[PDB]
Design a protein around this ligand. Structure first.
Ligand SMILES: Nc1ncnc2c1ncn2[C@@H]1O[C@H](COP(=O)(O)OP(=O)(O)CP(=O)(O)O)[C@@H](O)[C@H]1O
Ligand SMILES: O=C(O)C1=C[C@@H](O)[C@@H](O)[C@H](O)C1
Length: 168
């Protein structure tokens, strides 16, 4: 059982924070997007382009359920992880930290050049607003703790988290 599951829109910090939240607790971090690229031997960019999100979402669903019982440290979920009705029920009972972010910073932190299937230019922001709107509800449903990583220092966020994870 993960010491904490991290969910949030791509660009919310899931990785930056998943590392500091894991290194501070003394437990390895784990990414579902990365776990899938291993169990399949295929890049998520391909699995999407060739087989499709439909099938991908299934594979992710199976991989997540797999980590919710195997991993003992910090677990990080892919953006649309919470769109899978099955994934949301596997999260029931876990410590789920929803890292919130506004369309402003979210898009500013994702304008790099990593191949994001669901977030590709042009109008890469309209796409972000949509993802945010459509999913925001979902993240609330599975989140046992809502932390804002918007205006904050990657470390000051982990600071905030650990306190609320030790206090009732
Ligand atoms: N709490 C925070 N405050 C300030 N900037 C932060 C932040 N957390 C992360 N960032 C910045 O946001 C950028 C993207 O962060 P991150 O890589 O964690 O996205 P992500 O893991 O949510 C996306 P994906 O789901 O695609 O893997 C980095 O440049 C990072 O420095
Ligand atoms: O927003 C999403 O649903 C995604 C986020 C990434 O982590 C990858 O899992 C993939 O690009 C899909």
């Amino acid at each position: 059982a993960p010491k904490a599951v991290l969910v949030g829109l791509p660009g919310s910090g899931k990785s930056t924070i998943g590392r500091r939240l894991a290194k501070a607790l003394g437990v390895g971090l784990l990414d579902t997007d990365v776990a899938i690229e291993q169990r399949t031997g295929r890049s998520i960019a391909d699995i999407f382009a060739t087989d499709g999100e439909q099938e991908f979402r299934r594979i992710e669903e199976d991989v997540v359920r797999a980590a919710l019982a195997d991993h003992d440290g910090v677990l990080s979920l892919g953006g649309g992880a919470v769109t899978s009705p099955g994934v949301r029920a596997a999260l029931a009972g876990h410590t789920v930290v929803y890292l919130e972010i506004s369309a402003a910073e979210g898009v500013r932190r994702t304008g790099g050049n990593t191949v994001r299937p669901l977030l590709a230019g042009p109008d890469r922001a309209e796409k972000y607003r949509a993802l945010m709107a459509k999913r925001a509800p979902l993240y609330r449903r599975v989140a046992t703790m809502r932390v804002d990583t918007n205006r904050r220092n990657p470390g000051a966020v982990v600071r905030h988290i650990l306190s609320r994870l030790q206090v009732p």
